[PDB]
Amino acid sequence: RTLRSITSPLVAHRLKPIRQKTKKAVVSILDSEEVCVELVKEYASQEYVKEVLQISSDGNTITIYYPNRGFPLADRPPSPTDNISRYSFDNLPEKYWRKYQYASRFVQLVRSKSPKITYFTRYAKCILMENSPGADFEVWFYDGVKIHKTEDFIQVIEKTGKSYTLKSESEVNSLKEEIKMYMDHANEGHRICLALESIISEEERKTRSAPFFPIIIGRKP
Amino acid sequence: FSVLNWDQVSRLHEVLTEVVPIHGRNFPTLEITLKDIVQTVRSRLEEAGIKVHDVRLNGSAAGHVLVKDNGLGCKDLDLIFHVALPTEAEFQLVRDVVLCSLLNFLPEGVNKLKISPVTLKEAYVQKLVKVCTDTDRWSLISLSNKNGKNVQLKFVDSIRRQFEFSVDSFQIILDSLLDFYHDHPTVIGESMYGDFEEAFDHLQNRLIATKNPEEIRGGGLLKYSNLLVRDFRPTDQEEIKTLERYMCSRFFIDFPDILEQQRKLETYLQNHFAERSKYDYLMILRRVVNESTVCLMGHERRQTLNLISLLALRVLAE
C-alpha cells in the first residue's frame, strides 16, 4: 500500500535540538530543525556511519546519502558527500520507511516532552505540550501532586506516592471528594491553555513573523 | 527558436569526437569518445523500453561551442536525455544501462564479465545524484576526473529551473547530427533564459542577468563571483545591489552552519580552480558579502567574513 497510511510526516518545528544514541541508529534534531538519522556499524572496535537520512522540518524532504567502510562516528552528523538522493515523502521507496520511522517516533516523543504553553495557577504549574492534536497536559501542583493527561491515559501521582491511571469518565467521576477537585482544577487549566493556544496561533497566522510559541504565563508564588 | 551555422557546428564535431580519458582507482584507464557514449547509451535505453525524446549537450560545452573563447572553462560536458521516469525501477535500470554500456571498453573486457556492477562503480563513477520529489525528477551520473574533466550524464523527466545565469543557459539539441550519422544539417540551439537573442548577447559580450532570482539555490552567489573573477559585469545597477542582497540572503538560508559554509567554500575552491587564483576569488567574495549586507544581519555576516578571511590567509600561506 502507501507510506502515508502508516505514519504521518514528522513535525520538527520549535524543537530544541537533542541527540539520542540508540543501539542501531543515532537520531539528532539538528539545530536547523532538520531531523537526522544516521546508521551505525561497529567494526574493528570503532563505530562507523554507514548511511544518513536527513529530513526537513515538514517531513516532506528526505536527503539520503552514503559515504565511500564509511564515516567515523562524529558527534554532529557527517556532512553530505557526492552520492546523495532526494525524495519527497510519498515518493520515498519502501527501502527506507523503517529508518524514517525511527525519526518520526523520536520527534513524536520529543513533542510530548517539550512545553508549548506554560501557565502558573494559584495552585499548580500547567504545561501544555507541543504534540498537537491531542496535546499532552502536565499539571505539577505546588502541593507535590502530579496529574499527567495523555490521549486516553491520565496518571495521578498523589502526595504519598500512590499512582493510578484513569481511563474513561466512569473511573474519573468515581474518585473521592479530594482528588475530584484536583481534576476540576487541572481540567479548567487545560481549557484555559487550549483556548490560548488557538487564539495565539491564529494571531500568529495573521502576523507571520517570529514564532509566538513557546509561551510562559505567570510566576510561582 | 534559433539555428546554428557552420561557425559553431564545426566545434560540435570537435567536442563530440574529443577523446576523453577516464582514470580508474586497480582498474585501467578508459579512452572514450562522446558520440560513442551517447549512441551506446541511447541504444541500450531503447532496448529497455524507455522513450529517449531529446538528446542535448549542456553546460560549459554548449557555452564554448556557441562562442570560441568566452572565458568560462571547458570543465563541464553535460548530456541531457529527456526520459520518462515514473517508477523507481526506471532509475534502478538507467544505472544498469550506463554501466553495461561502460563495460564494452577493453580487449580482456568480457573476459572479466565476473565483475559486479557495484564493483565497476568503484573506479568509473565519481558523482552520483538522484532526485525524485514532487516537482523535480531526474538522475545524474558523473565520470572520473583526473587528466581530463568530468563527463556528466543527466537523465531528466521533470526539472523546474535548469540554468545558472544567462551565460550558461544554452543547450544544443543533438537530434540533428545524431540522425546525421558544408556537410552539416539544421542544429537547433536554445536558451533556458527565454528569448534566445538577448541571452546570446549576454554571453558574447560577457554580461550577467537573470529575471528568475526567486528560484536560485543558495550557492548561486558562488557562481556570481566565479563570473566576476573571469571578468563579467551586470546590466542594470537598478537591480544589482538588490540582487546581491537577495543572493546573500538565500546563501545564509541554505547554509546556516559555519561548517557547512566552510565545506562548500573549500569544495568549490578545490573543484573549480586548477592553475593562487583562489585568492582573487576569495577577495571578490569578501567585497560582495561585505558591501551587499543588510545592517540588521550583523553577526550572521560577521562569522562569514571572518571565515572567508581565514580561507584567504590560508591560501596565501600556501
**For the domain that residue A131 is a member of, what is the CATH number?**
3.30.1120.130
CA dist., res. A197 & res. B199, Å (int) = 52
Which among B2, B12, B1 has a CA at the least distance from the CA of B183? B12
| 3-state DSSP assignment of residue B142 | strand
Pairing mode, strands B128-132 and B137-142: antiparallel
- Per the entry, the structure determination technique was X-ray
A195 & A90 share domain: no
Residue B197 burial by CB count (10 A; 0-12/13-18/19+): exposed, middle or buried? Answer: exposed
For B244, the grid coordinates are 546581491
A27 & A95 share domain: yes
CB environment A14-45: b (16+ within 10 A), e (fewer): ebeeeeeeeeebbbbbbeebbbbbbbbeeeee
A196 & A93 share domain: no
For residue B1, give the amino acid letter: F
A90 & A127 share domain: no
A83 & A57 share domain: yes
CB-CB contact of A149 with A166 (8 Å): no
Chain B's closest residue to A85, CA to CA, is: B130
CB-CB contact of A60 with A89 (8 Å): yes
CA dist., res. A139 & res. A136, Å (int) = 10
| Alpha-carbon distances, residue A25 vs A31, A75, A76, B94, B299 (angstroms) | 19, 13, 13, 31, 35
Q: Bridge-partner residues for A47, per DSSP?
A: A42
Which among B237, B22, B272, B40 has a CA at the least distance from the CA of B123? B22
Which among A168, A154, A121 has a CA at the least distance from the CA of A140? A121
* Residue with the three cell numbers 541508529: A25
A54 & A72 share domain: yes
A133 contact partners, CB below 8 Å, separation of at least 6 = none
B247 contact partners, CB below 8 Å, separation of at least 6 = B213, B216, B220, B221, B224, B292
A87 has a chain B CB within 8 A of its CB? yes
Backbone torsions φ then ψ of A67, nearest 5 degrees: -70, 170
A143 & A170 share domain: yes
For residue B131, give the amino acid letter: V
Which of A96, A114, A132 represents a domain boundary (last residue)?
Answer: A114
Q: Please report the residues numbered 99 through 138 in chain A whose beta carbons come closer than 8 angstroms to any beta carbon of chain B.
A: none
| Structural domains counted in chain A | 2
A161 CB-side CA count, 13 A? 0
A105 & A143 share domain: no
CA dist., res. B165 & res. B246, Å (int) = 15
Chain B's closest residue to A66, CA to CA, is: B128
The phi-psi region of residue A44 (left if phi > 0; otherwise alpha if psi is between -120 and 50; otherwise beta) is left
Backbone torsions φ then ψ of B161, nearest 5 degrees: -120, 125
Within its chain, how far is the Cα of B275 from the centroid?
Answer: 20
B254 has a chain A CB within 8 A of its CB? no
CA dist., res. A88 & res. B134, Å (int) = 6
A108 & A2 share domain: yes
CB-CB contact of B217 with B165 (8 Å): no
The phi-psi region of residue B119 (left if phi > 0; otherwise alpha if psi is between -120 and 50; otherwise beta) is alpha
CB-CB contact of B59 with B78 (8 Å): yes
CA dist., res. A103 & res. A100, Å (int) = 5
DSSP letter string over chain A?
--STTT-PPP--TTPPP-EEE-SSEEEEE-TTS-EEEEEEEEETTEEEEEEEEEE-TTS-EEEEE-----EE--SSPPPP-S-EEEEEGGGS-GGGHHHHHHHHHHHHHHGGGSEEEEEE-SSEEEEEES--SS--EEEEETTS-EEEE-SS-EEEE-SSS-EEEE-SHHHHHTS-TTHHHHHHHHHHHHHHHHHHHHHHHHHHHHH-SS---SEEE----
A120 & A44 share domain: no
Domain boundaries, chain B: 1-208, 209-318
CA dist., res. B65 & res. B72, Å (int) = 12
CB-CB contact of B153 with B182 (8 Å): no
Q: From the list B133, B142, B256, which residue is nearest A88 (CB)? A: B133
Question: In 10 A of CB B171, how many CB atoms?
Answer: 21
CB-CB contact of A128 with A135 (8 Å): yes
CA dist., res. A117 & res. B158, Å (int) = 44
Cβ-Cβ contacts under 8 Å between A and B: the total is 37
A207 has a chain B CB within 8 A of its CB? no
Reported resolution in A? 3.8
Question: In 10 A of CB A211, how many CB atoms?
Answer: 9
CB–CB contact A84 B129 (8 Å) = yes
The phi-psi region of residue A134 (left if phi > 0; otherwise alpha if psi is between -120 and 50; otherwise beta) is left
Provide the CATH number for the domain around residue A12: 3.30.1120.120
Domain that holds residue A39: 1-114
A130 & A72 share domain: no
Which of A114, A146, A170 represents a domain boundary (last residue)?
Answer: A114
Within its chain, how far is the Cα of A51 from the centroid?
Answer: 24
Which of A114, A136, A159 represents a domain boundary (last residue)?
Answer: A114
A129 & A206 share domain: yes
* Residue with the three cell numbers 545597477: B237
Q: From the list A32, A60, A85, which residue is nearest B130 (CB)? A: A85
